Amino acid sequence: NIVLAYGEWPEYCPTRPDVSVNRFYTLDSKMWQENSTGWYWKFPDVLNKTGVFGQNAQFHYLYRSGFCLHVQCNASKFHQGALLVAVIPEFVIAGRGSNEAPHPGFTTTFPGTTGATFYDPYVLDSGVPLSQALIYPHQWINLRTNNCATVIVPYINAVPFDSAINHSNFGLIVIPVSPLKYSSGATTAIPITITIAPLNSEFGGLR
């Protein structure tokens, strides 16, 4: 069923919009081939410059909202392999150099509506081993039994209001733990689609 993040319902204690921004969004359906290696998105950057919510976070500079996700991959009963859906707070990536000090830059660290690609999966591109990576709220999508995952995440930040262009509250990761296998005579690409819905937005500031 659903799985909360750390056991907390998202609520709020500034303007308060309603059901016009309670509508579901739908990002682009990716393609998970035989040798792909993982994606990440870094909410709430990917809801900028899009829709009604984009015109309330681009022109306001205070922000608070908890999300509600729905990850769903569609595949028949002759494919196998399991994904991994985890929600990491404060997701910091680092540059892969060694020395000077080659930073990631900008075009990787804020991907926007197109998700990025992990370079090295085994260490989560941040120096943290994947074997220990189930402390976070996780949910197995396992293509023999179930194909839906429903995580609800409340607002986790120290300061009660932050900006929505500079900062980034958390990130969503998707990793193929078992590689996908199929006998010949089927499709190659199992799509992966995401659904995002803001629960309690509460904006502040003007222009």
Binding site: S76, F78, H79, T193
Partner: protein, 44 residues
Amino acid sequence: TLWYQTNYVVPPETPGEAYIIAMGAAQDNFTLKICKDTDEVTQQ
């Protein structure tokens, strides 16, 4: 319109061409007004 969210997925040895038929009707609050004859093709 009818956008394609995702590519069709079929397991092996099943044909990959389906067909979506359409329907159509009108609901309960559909009204009409001034009578008029129509445009056929013939006349006898």
